Amino acid sequence: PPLSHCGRAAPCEPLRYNVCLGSVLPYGATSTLLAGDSDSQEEAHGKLVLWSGLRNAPRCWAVIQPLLCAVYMPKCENDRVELPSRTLCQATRGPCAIVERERGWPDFLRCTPDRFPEGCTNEVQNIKFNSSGQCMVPLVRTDNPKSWYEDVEGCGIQCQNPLFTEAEHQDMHSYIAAFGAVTGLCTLFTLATFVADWRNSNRYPAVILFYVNACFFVGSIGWLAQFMDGARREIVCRADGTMRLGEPTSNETLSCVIIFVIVYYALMAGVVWFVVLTYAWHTSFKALGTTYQPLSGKTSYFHLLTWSLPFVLTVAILAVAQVDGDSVSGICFVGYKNYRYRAGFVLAPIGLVLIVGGYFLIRGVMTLFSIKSNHAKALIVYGSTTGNTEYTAETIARELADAGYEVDSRDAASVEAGGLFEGFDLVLLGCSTWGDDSIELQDDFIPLFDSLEETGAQGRKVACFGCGDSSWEYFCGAVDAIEEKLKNLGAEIVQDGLRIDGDPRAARDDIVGWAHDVRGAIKINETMLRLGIFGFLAFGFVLITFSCHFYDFFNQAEWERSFRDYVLCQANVTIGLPTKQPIPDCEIKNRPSLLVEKINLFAMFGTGIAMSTWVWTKATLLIWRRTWCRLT
Amino acid sequence: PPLSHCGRAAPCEPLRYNVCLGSVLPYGATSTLLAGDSDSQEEAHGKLVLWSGLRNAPRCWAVIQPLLCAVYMPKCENDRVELPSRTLCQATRGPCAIVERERGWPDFLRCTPDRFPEGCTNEVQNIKFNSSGQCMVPLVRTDNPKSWYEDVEGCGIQCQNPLFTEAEHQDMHSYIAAFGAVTGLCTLFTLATFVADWRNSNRYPAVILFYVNACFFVGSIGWLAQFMDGARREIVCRADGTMRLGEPTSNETLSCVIIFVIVYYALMAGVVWFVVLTYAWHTSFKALGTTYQPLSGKTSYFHLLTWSLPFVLTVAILAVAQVDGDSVSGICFVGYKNYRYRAGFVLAPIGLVLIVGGYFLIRGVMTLFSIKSNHAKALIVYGSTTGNTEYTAETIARELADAGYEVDSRDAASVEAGGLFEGFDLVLLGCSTWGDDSIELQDDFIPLFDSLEETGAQGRKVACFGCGDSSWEYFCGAVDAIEEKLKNLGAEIVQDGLRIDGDPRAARDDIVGWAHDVRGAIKINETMLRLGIFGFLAFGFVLITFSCHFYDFFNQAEWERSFRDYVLCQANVTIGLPDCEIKNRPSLLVEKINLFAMFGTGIAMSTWVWTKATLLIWRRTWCRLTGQSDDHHH
Ligand SMILES: CN(C(=O)c1ccc([N+](=O)[O-])cc1C(F)(F)F)C1CCN(c2nnc(-c3ccnn3C)c3ccccc23)CC1
Ligand SMILES: CN(C(=O)c1ccc([N+](=O)[O-])cc1C(F)(F)F)C1CCN(c2nnc(-c3ccnn3C)c3ccccc23)CC1
Ligand SMILES: Cc1cc2nc3c(=O)[nH]c(=O)nc-3n(C[C@H](O)[C@H](O)[C@H](O)COP(=O)(O)O)c2cc1C
Ligand SMILES: Cc1cc2nc3c(=O)[nH]c(=O)nc-3n(C[C@H](O)[C@H](O)[C@H](O)COP(=O)(O)O)c2cc1C
């Protein structure tokens, strides 16, 4: 028999509607007493149309359907209305959290033991509700609870990024394919020539560039993996069809974490190897100049920090499980869902490598500049009858002085040969050619030339100059004669002698140009100069990468808000009221800049392409020549 | 009955001496009236002893004996002395010319019709004078009037030279035999080789040497003829036994003129052929830069001069007849008796050949310092990283340039392999070795090395150089690799590669030395060089021959005087009244120096055919004349 507490006294009225939310009712009489907002059957039906807006977020729709029928259209028999049980009310509370977040549970729909008593026959339990509901365009029906997006239980955020169009996806994928393929090809070539000359190329100053290339090559594979037949969807989408978030996760393939490790580890190992490059260039200077020695046996110290620090970071990300997948970039990365993790694991280490790496580039430049000031003394000895070589000597003297040299210009007529060149870094000898039948040096240079053995030319950096006339046999013969004696004594001829035809005043810029080139030939370690250009080149690209990561960090807080606001509005679970126009009324107020990402990738992949040019010398042609030759 | 004019009135005195100059007198009384210098018989006898000094020069002694007896010891019978006939007086005048030349005929011995009447009975005509006189040691009795020495009629100068001993004659004859036989043998060998390959060897710059040898061969025969058994005495001595002087002479054998023509003609034809040799070298050496053959038409004009000039001179000597024989030299020559003819026909032509021949040798040395600077082209391509090979290349370049080459020094980095070697006589490739585990060529040389096929190396004269370090295994591996590829392409590697260990500045003179030796192995005209040495060699020997002939010319005037003074002194012809010696004579050493320089020219010129080619000439001669080919005949 029915319980007295499971029923309430109310006047029974015949059912004007034979259907409740698509399901037929076994009874013929109802009551508008249980629904506090409705007075009539026409009003209760009107409220059900507003409540049917919860079709979206179906895991709520399945439990809210019988409860709404048990309150708005209940069973009335012999002036008694059937009350809905407490279990029917409590079943909605969880999955229908959206109600309390949007509209709020009304007085009559809250689980009060007075309104919803314990252990009552629901009547709606016998009634079968076939209707399931569906998920709106941005979302997708997922059975997996781990794939449910916020409030909307039963639905999940789709794999393809809803903020960017298919056209933008195709455009970004073409951009990664182009840069990835070039960087992959270029670095492969560099790794190949290094192993083809492995015993010789293992020398510590240049071996850094092999490992710098190794990282960008491995990184290229991670970015290009998305291009294999259907790989992108194995890396970015979950088994059901929703985007991968908060990776490493249970009951899902490793395809996302594998590609993340390849991309992030190689990115971090590469930036640590850049700091090794900056340190090495900086320390190689003080090995010759002052006291510091080459660390050509630091294999167990450089490989220690370059392979350990990215390992600690990669392991830490998998621990906090912040590996998120993305369709536009086609890779799994740290902090796509939560911007804070991308800032902590990417922006902070890149900032640390720029300050530590930048310090070494500044230090080495300061060492380069201090060495040049200790090698800036120059002696200019000239032999001139008519003053043409005297004028050239003076013109050379100002160009060196303007460049930071301490020039000492002397006339050969007023000099003593014994120990003349002692205390000078550069010695420039100038002499005009005389003699009709033959080559005769200018009269004042003869005593110096004859006793050139006593000057201290052995190992001295020298260059010759002089004035002559083409209208004479043996043009600038003095320059030839001086260059020959200096070469025989052991001097280091810096440049081919400046031979002036005619009036030197008209060849002013030739003299200025020669003196410019003569300082240019003063080598401050050619083998180490390349290491410095590559250091400053890598810094430039790393600085652009940092800027782009800073833009995303400083703005993603607003983009995440806009992502939430758009997806939740598009979910169409407007329980409260019907819109003025059918109009969708959903827009993205602000989204991430794809240009900034393209600038980021250009700077990233560009470092790999820039560092691969380390092996773009004549020596490399010779390396593969021996290989082919010796293979044959 | 005796004529009144064939006798004079004088007091007869008995003969104190029964003998007159070794002959007994048929009468017993004499007179001292006919002899104007003698008053007594003791005085007349005393004058006969001074007159008996004319025993020497017997052509005179035989006729003066009866005349001296008919004047100093005449027949006196019944206070009448017999006068000597005019015919007895006139018979002495000719052969006793010495008397009138030295002392002069006295008043009583001159043929006056008063003192010597015509047609008188000379009682001395019945008296037989057995004495015939004598000729002292350097002279010898000759019946031939053409063989009589100066005033001494009946005697002639002996064949063997009185100024030189038999010991000196034997010594000089041994010296001529030795040099003559060697020169004869050596020149015969050279004449045989030029004939054994006449066609190939008839080339005109070199065929001069065949005719130069031909003259010394013929000359050798003339000098050696004296060694044929008894020949020397047929060449040097006249039929009687006196030395041959101014041969061509009547009723004497041709043995002296034959040997003279052989010796003098060959001596003169040889010195004219020396002037041809000097002229030919001078003109051929000058025309080396052009195909112009200067000795082309001249060939005929060369034989004209060399065979006519000695002929004209030989004929001229036979005309002036100054061919004199000599025992010490064993040959007949021009101007042995009169030094002036030897000076004119021997010293003057030899002086003329030295001034004309000397001019051409000078002109040829002027050509030597005109031609060197003018024509060799050399390319030096180097591969240098550290500048060591660049420095070596420059050191090599300045050395070739100093020697007269036109050097083109290039860096391998700035060269195109395609026909790179085209237009150069010499190509010098330089490269350093690189590579840690192996041999790797200097970086700039690799493109050139790889396309070395296209350089034009086939048959090109090349040499390699390069710097290395012994500290690295495979020292100068690049030098090895380059000359191996060059050898495989068909190039001519001139010298083994200059491989520098360490700094080339410390090995400067080694580079200088190597560069020098590289220039040498480039073949030159060895035939022209050889012609020039033989020209200067022949001049040297001719200059010594001239010196020796000048010594004899400048001194024989004194030697001729000493020859006359010594010979006439020994003779002892005392018309009426001891230290007989040679004051100065010719130097036999000077003659030995003369022969050494003369015969030495022939021996020196015969060495022209002392090459490897000659061995081949006689190899092909034997086989060819043995019927077989290089194995056996087909
Ligand atoms: C994350 N995100 C979203 O749209 C997004 C997705 C999910 C949620 N959410 O809440 O679930 C929120 C968002 C929002 F709020 F919009 F950000 C963007 C994805 C695209 N994009 C990129 N970012 N980095 C790189 C790059 C450069 C160098 N290395 N890498 C790794 C990169 C490279 C190529 C192309 C794009 C790139 C910027 C951020
Ligand atoms: C000439 N005379 C006389 O003694 C002589 C003879 C006769 C009178 N006289 O009045 O009747 C005078 C003299 C005198 F005054 F003594 F000289 C010497 C003879 C020997 N001798 C030589 N001279 N030439 C040659 C030779 C050199 C190159 N070619 N030839 C042909 C030669 C060769 C070999 C050996 C000796 C040689 C030196 C001179
Ligand atoms: C005697 C004489 C010889 C010369 N020989 C040469 C010569 O060998 N090579 C040459 O290039 N110029 C030659 N010149 C030109 C001078 O080198 C030229 O004028 C030069 O500019 C003079 O230099 P100065 O003014 O420094 O003394 C010669 C000029 C003279 C008058
Ligand atoms: C990497 C290296 C490899 C070398 N290999 C060789 C070698 O195999 N054999 C050798 O003789 N020298 C070798 N050397 C020495 C050089 O040939 C030497 O320094 C030379 O003088 C360089 O001359 P350059 O200035 O013309 O280039 C080597 C030197 C270096 C630095």
Ligand SMILES: *[C@@H]1O[C@H](CO)[C@@H](O)[C@H](O)[C@H]1NC(C)=O
């Ligand atoms: C919401 O869903 C209902 C039912 O599917 C549909 O009629 C309506 O057009 C949707 N509204 C919007 C704005 O998407």
